């Protein structure tokens, strides 16, 4: 279909591309907004404080100034957010992972 | 005394926002103190007549630092006029704590709240208008007296922006005996207050017990670079226009 014909000579080609796709719909900040509980390690939509973005928020190592909401990195973009409820802060690693190429 | 001004070497930094950075040199566009300026230094050596606390000029963002221990400097009063028909802010580091009265207070011809508790009623006389009342945690603030080596090096910005009066701080155990010394450290966030009120000028309300010591800058629309390391601090940073080599850097 990509290459609009009928037969295909031997070779690797990319058709597609390939991004998982995120579970669930968190939103936070009814710390003193709605509830939701904390779930890793898997692809969700989450809501910090208006942040609204896409991850896996995995478990953080860095350490925070206990004023700071957020974090980013060299390319200036969200890495780490604080809890808004339990005070704590977790990475965030986007899985939109890779194309998808056949072999034929 | 006449202001002798002198050198700030490299003073006046602050976090400008909120977000938290690693290894990363970031250049910010923000109000921050000229480097290498002269600091408009109110000479409160006493043992002269430094009780010139007129209407000072409250531009945008004031580096009021002070060298003192003794806090003589219990309260600080800022208005446009400070004629009793204006929302005037008070920050008074009271007994309690450092209370945040911002008010329609009716002022009277000399516009002070002198020692007399701020009892002589120039400033405040009656709770009409009051947006809101920021009493802050109440801490050991006992109207302090110890003085000597002056360790406690309490450094305050005191800046206005979109209404917010936004109050930084610092307390570095540093000693020294004389006016500000070489060295880096960046000021945090204390403070935000979330009002609308405009002002124009402020005082420096000394205890009647005077010999003291308290600085007044004043900042500037520039851009620094500033050097996050590890842990996540400001380590370092240049002014971007300041030199030719601080420009290429």
């Given at each position: 279909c990509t290459l609009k014909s009928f037969t295909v000579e031997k070779g690797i080609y990319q058709?597609?591309?390939?991004?998982?796709?995120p579970t669930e719909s968190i939103v936070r900040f009814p710390n003193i907004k709605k509830s939701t509980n904390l779930v890793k390690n898997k692809c969700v939509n989450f809501n910090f404080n208006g942040l609204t973005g896409?991850?896996?928020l995995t478990e953080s190592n860095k350490k925070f100034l206990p004023f700071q909401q957020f974090g980013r990195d060299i390319a200036?973009?969200?890495?780490?957010?604080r809890d808004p409820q339990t005070l704590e802060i977790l990475d965030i690693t986007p899985c939109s992972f890779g194309g998808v190429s056949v072999i034929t | 005394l006449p202001p002798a001004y002198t050198n700030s070497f490299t003073r006046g930094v602050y976090y400008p926002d909120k977000v938290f950075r690693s290894s990363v040199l970031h250049s910010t566009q923000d109000l921050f103190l000229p480097f290498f300026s002269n600091v408009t230094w109110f000479h409160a050596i006493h043992v002269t007549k430094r009780f010139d606390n007129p209407v000072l000029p409250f531009n945008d963002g004031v580096y009021?630092?002070?060298t003192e221990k003794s806090n003589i400097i219990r309260g600080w009063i800022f208005g446009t006029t400070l004629d009793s028909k204006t929302q005037?802010?008070?920050?008074?580091?009271?007994?309690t704590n450092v209370v945040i009265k911002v008010c329609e207070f009716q002022f009277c011809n000399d516009p002070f709240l002198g020692v007399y508790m701020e009892s002589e009623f120039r400033v405040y006389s009656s709770a009409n208008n009051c947006t809101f009342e920021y009493v802050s945690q109440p801490f050991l603030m006992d109207l302090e007296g110890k003085q000597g080596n002056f360790k406690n090096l309490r450094e305050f910005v005191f800046k206005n922006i979109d209404g917010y009066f936004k109050i930084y701080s610092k307390h570095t155990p540093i000693n020294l005996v004389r006016d500000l010394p070489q060295g880096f450290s960046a000021l945090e966030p204390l403070v935000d207050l979330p009002i609308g009120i405009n002002i124009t000028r402020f005082q420096?309300?000394?205890?009647?017990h005077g010999a003291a010591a308290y600085y007044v800058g004043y900042l500037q629309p520039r851009t620094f670079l500033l050097k996050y390391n590890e842990n996540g601090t400001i380590t370092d940073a240049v002014d971007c226009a300041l030199d030719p080599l601080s420009e290429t850097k």
């Amino acid at each position: 279909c990509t290459l609009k014909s009928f037969t295909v000579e031997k070779g690797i080609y990319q058709t597609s591309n390939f991004r998982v796709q995120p579970t669930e719909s968190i939103v936070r900040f009814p710390n003193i907004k709605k509830s939701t509980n904390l779930v890793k390690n898997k692809c969700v939509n989450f809501n910090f404080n208006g942040l609204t973005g896409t991850g896996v928020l995995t478990e953080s190592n860095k350490k925070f100034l206990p004023f700071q909401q957020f974090g980013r990195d060299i390319a200036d973009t969200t890495d780490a957010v604080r809890d808004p409820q339990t005070l704590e802060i977790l990475d965030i690693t986007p899985c939109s992972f890779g194309g998808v190429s056949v072999i034929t | 005394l006449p202001p002798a001004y002198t050198n700030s070497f490299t003073r006046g930094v602050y976090y400008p926002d909120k977000v938290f950075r690693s290894s990363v040199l970031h250049s910010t566009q923000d109000l921050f103190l000229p480097f290498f300026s002269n600091v408009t230094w109110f000479h409160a050596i006493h043992v002269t007549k430094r009780f010139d606390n007129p209407v000072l000029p409250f531009n945008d963002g004031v580096y009021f630092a002070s060298t003192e221990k003794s806090n003589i400097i219990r309260g600080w009063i800022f208005g446009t006029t400070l004629d009793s028909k204006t929302q005037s802010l008070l920050i008074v580091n009271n007994a309690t704590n450092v209370v945040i009265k911002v008010c329609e207070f009716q002022f009277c011809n000399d516009p002070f709240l002198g020692v007399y508790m701020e009892s002589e009623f120039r400033v405040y006389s009656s709770a009409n208008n009051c947006t809101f009342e920021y009493v802050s945690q109440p801490f050991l603030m006992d109207l302090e007296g110890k003085q000597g080596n002056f360790k406690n090096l309490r450094e305050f910005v005191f800046k206005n922006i979109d209404g917010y009066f936004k109050i930084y701080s610092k307390h570095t155990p540093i000693n020294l005996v004389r006016d500000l010394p070489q060295g880096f450290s960046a000021l945090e966030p204390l403070v935000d207050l979330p009002i609308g009120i405009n002002i124009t000028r402020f005082q420096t309300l000394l205890a009647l017990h005077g010999a003291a010591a308290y600085y007044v800058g004043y900042l500037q629309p520039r851009t620094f670079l500033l050097k996050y390391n590890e842990n996540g601090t400001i380590t370092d940073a240049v002014d971007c226009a300041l030199d030719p080599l601080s420009e290429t850097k």
